[PDB]
Amino acid sequence: FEKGYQSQLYTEMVGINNISKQFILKNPLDDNQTIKSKLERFVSGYKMNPKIAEKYNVSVHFVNKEKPRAYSLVGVPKTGTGYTLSVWMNSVGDGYKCRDAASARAHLETLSSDVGCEAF
Numbered sequence: 001f002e003k004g005y006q007s008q009l010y011t012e013m014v015g016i017n018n019i020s021k022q023f024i025l026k027n028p029l030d031d032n033q034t035i036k037s038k039l040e041r042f043v044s045g046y047k048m049n050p051k052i053a054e055k056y057n058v059s060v061h062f063v064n065k066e067k068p069r070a071y072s073l074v075g076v077p078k079t080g081t082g083y084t085l086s087v088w089m090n091s092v093g094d095g096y097k098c099r100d101a102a103s104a105r106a107h108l109e110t111l112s113s114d115v116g117c118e119a120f
Contacts, residue, residue, distance in 0.1 A: 006085035006097060009056050009075045010120060012048045013087055014095065016058065017073060021091060025069050036068040043073065055083060076101040088117065095120050 024038050043060040047053060058075045062068055071091050077083035086104035089095035098104040098117035108116040 002083055002085055005052065005055060005083070006087065008049065008052050009058075010087045010095060010097065012052055013058060013073050013075050013089055016043060016046055016048075017089055017091065017093070020060075020071075025091065032066050032068050036062060036065055039068060039071060054078075055081060072107055074104050074107075076104050086117075087120075 020039060020042065024035060024042060027035070030038070039060045043058060046058065048056070048058070056075050056077055058073060060071050060073055062071050064070065069091060073087075073089050075087040077086065084100050086098040086101045087096065088098065088104040088107050096104075096107075096109065096117035097120045098108065099111065099114055103116045109119070110116055111118055
């Protein structure tokens with residue numbers, strides 16, 4: 001069950017990524033400060049399937065505020081719910097299923113024992 005929920009989260013995040021890329025990143029003339037806050041408003045205000053929104057928070061992250069087109073999305077369970085499985089992904093399209101929220105916030109790419117993420 002929680003695995004099914006992590007799948008739908010994955011699929012929602014892909015949906016969010018695709019709209020971000022095609023409607024926000026694609027704007028020809030917005031400056032990097034504008035792209036960055038638009039990404040942040042859009043992502044943080046987006047309403048996932050209510051089954052999923054009840055259980056997960058989705059956020060967008062930047063290494064470099066001057067390269068906002070390089071961002072990742074982190075999907076993690078709401079605090080205190082007993083859920084652990086998480087997701088993260090690239091603006092470039094590489095996505096990951098993670099065994100815990102920490103590994104999603106760390107954008108890990110492989111598993112080790114039962115910690116980390118795998119390419120999906």
